[PDB]
């Protein structure tokens, strides 16, 4: 019931909070930067303040203090569902508080009234070739939508730093509302013979309109979509996509530009693209070893994949050190809905083998699986076999998280992200020599 | 030190590098290089050095050093057009990549190579020709880059299962093609918007990259050709902590292709606090003229400056995250004006500001740096030569910046830098970590 008002009052409490805190500990040390950290992608450096979520290496992600199961229980469900609606999540990430069902409905409704594409985007999408990857299409379409930016106007217009957050809030609501429109058009155009996406039923929830535009009607596939979109929404801020959005948002680029840049990062093979990668490898697996393999043959398939310089897709993590609750959460879902699925059973079998392999191999820090290892198998089951699209789905979810933070970054006037770089030759000089 | 094919040269260079970093890392990987305080975390990583970037290094007191070289030094050492004064961007790219100063031949080969690789796919052209005039030039550029990704050789190869070792090779190809296509793209944007969709003509395999650019832009003055060589050379790289450089670095570390990494960087560059400043300094200067008139007094200037600050606004093209003095790129450009457009009224106003602004900023006590940066002096040079469409200004900066960023991109891959993935913290957790306040 008026998320903008809600924010309007939470803001100054928090501004207060930090100032006083910074006054006290501004110069207090929270860490040490090492030569290896610099060469190792800031591995283990605590270099960002990100509010919407925190990641625990052992326990996983907590969204505003809540774990996945906690959310699963707490957040409002649909009419007669079991899976939490992403609208709730979004309210939670933004507010810090559990939304009521009324609040949740208000969002759905808000996201329905704002879903609307400019024709220039439409045309573009319609002229894209079928050889251009869906993420690229997605990314390029978003960038193009920036002509609609309110923040971009207000800013040129001369707004006060103070009001920045309000513009960003509108840009943010509008993008999340349109994303499914762009995502759906992409699918259709690529996989549905360019058929129309149709309309938004103002009376449905965001996932539900999305699935319609996609042209899927299994009510269970709807529930999946809800779960899918909830769980991929945020993953603290050091992740490539979030960080990107955050780094780019810092220069004051609008939310369209920022999200788009984040998509380019999500699309990397070591990141969100792994969604799709996993699937491709699982398929090729099935071709070779066949539908039902022996643990023994599975091992070698991995033992091979390894001494051959390749990584096992969906396994490993920069931060997590244990099995990702996102993975588990998905597996519980399969267990309740597609337990007899062959692909599913394989994924399941992989779970018992890879970790030991990745343990005797001795390189990976995290021998366990991440969300990526398990999403595709679910999708595929419901008929969405177009694996080059999976990352798009992840992208649409990630907007929830990143944008929720975008508002806060500007509301708290976080400045330009600009660290200092060094050359090896200078680092050597600093230390002495290697 | 030298012969013609960059690729062969690189290939040789590479392994010695790796060995070095390796042993160095062997003795000191655990050797602490610095801090981490609460303030730097909230402060956008200000003052934290936590990134390796080989191509350039910025000294806060002296300015950018290319591969140990300063601008003036590059200014003299680098090869020039047959009959120019200005360094050619091709030479700088070579320097940046190889860490060595190129010969004329060496440069010529680069030009030829960039000429050769210059080709846009139809879909991109279609797309560009279909964009509305209200779609900012930077968005066009960024969306065009992303869509060109259909061509990525690294992407393809990667999917086909190449070895981590070979990665750099495809990135070298993708970068070369991208440096090569950029002007085509940029020119098409300019044409479309300001030249009633006329055609960009063709590439002259014999010309230098900038020359072919100005031709496609429709600019024929040699002085402007010369300005372009300088411009593209000077906005090249600025160590890796700047938004654009860092964004390409971050995205590339994920194995996204160069097209993707670059386009993302473009989105950072388009930020009002970043490359977009180019444009703002000009919009700001225009407004200023309109009010104050042409021959304003220092006192009137000063005041207008104070107005801007009180409106809660920043003086455009002044201040910097790292630099603590006047940017050498600023100076460099002032010298060029001094020599070629000593009496432009706009030029004169920039010069005036130069003597007024830093004192006011000093007085206001906010800015760590009260001196000018590159973006404060670039638009005036363009304007003078007829390129008066300021919304396009950052596009040229972007074309320039592809040189630094792509040069390191190859190196990061060549050197196997991993995924850039830091640790985020919430205020609450941070507090808890400390005691709170
Ligand atoms: C995600 C990941 C890149 C994390 O990077 P990083 O923190 O450097 O891994 P690490 O610290 O455990 O690296 C130690 C070594 O083990 C290797 N390793 C790590 N994970 C794996 C894996 N799943 N399979 C094989 N080798 C692996 C690393 O490549 C590295 O080897 P080398 O020393 O020869 O470079 C890494 O786990 C990986 O490559 N994963 C496979 C990626 C994939 O296809 N799907 C999973 C999604 S990637 C998700 C991320 O963005 C994340 F945060 F996890 F990095
Ligand atoms: C580049 C800049 C963003 C660096 O930011 P930062 O490192 O945070 O500067 P800082 O620490 O000195 O700023 C401290 C205070 O001085 C103010 N200040 C800094 N520069 C200026 C300026 N040019 N005019 C007025 N006030 C300024 C800051 O806004 C800040 O005020 P507050 O604390 O009340 O928010 C900054 O000086 C600025 O805003 N410049 C003007 C931007 C512009 O339109 N053109 C110049 C190109 S920006 C160069 C860069 O480094 C960047 F990375 F941003 F691209």
From Swiss-Prot, chain B:
One of its GO terms (biological process) is carbohydrate metabolic process. Its main location: mitochondrion. It is an enzyme of class 2 (transferase). GO terms for molecular function: citrate (Si)-synthase activity; citrate synthase activity; identical protein binding. The active site is at 274, 320, 375. It is found in: Mitochondrion matrix. The keyword Signal does not apply. Pathway: Carbohydrate metabolism; tricarboxylic acid cycle; isocitrate from oxaloacetate: step 1/2. InterPro entries: Citrate_synth-like_lrg_a-sub, Citrate_synth-like_sm_a-sub, Citrate_synthase, Citrate_synthase_AS, Citrate_synthase_euk, Citrate_synthase_sf. GO terms for cellular component: mitochondrial matrix; mitochondrion. Its EC number is 2.3.3.1. PROSITE patterns: CITRATE_SYNTHASE. Oxaloacetate binds at residues 329, 401, 421. It catalyses: oxaloacetate + acetyl-CoA + H2O = citrate + CoA + H(+). It holds the Pfam family Citrate_synt. Key enzyme of the Krebs tricarboxylic acid cycle which catalyzes the synthesis of citrate from acetyl coenzyme A and oxaloacetate. Homodimer. Citrate synthase is found in nearly all cells capable of oxidative metabolism. Belongs to the citrate synthase family. This is Citrate synthase, mitochondrial. It comes from Gallus gallus. The gene is CS.
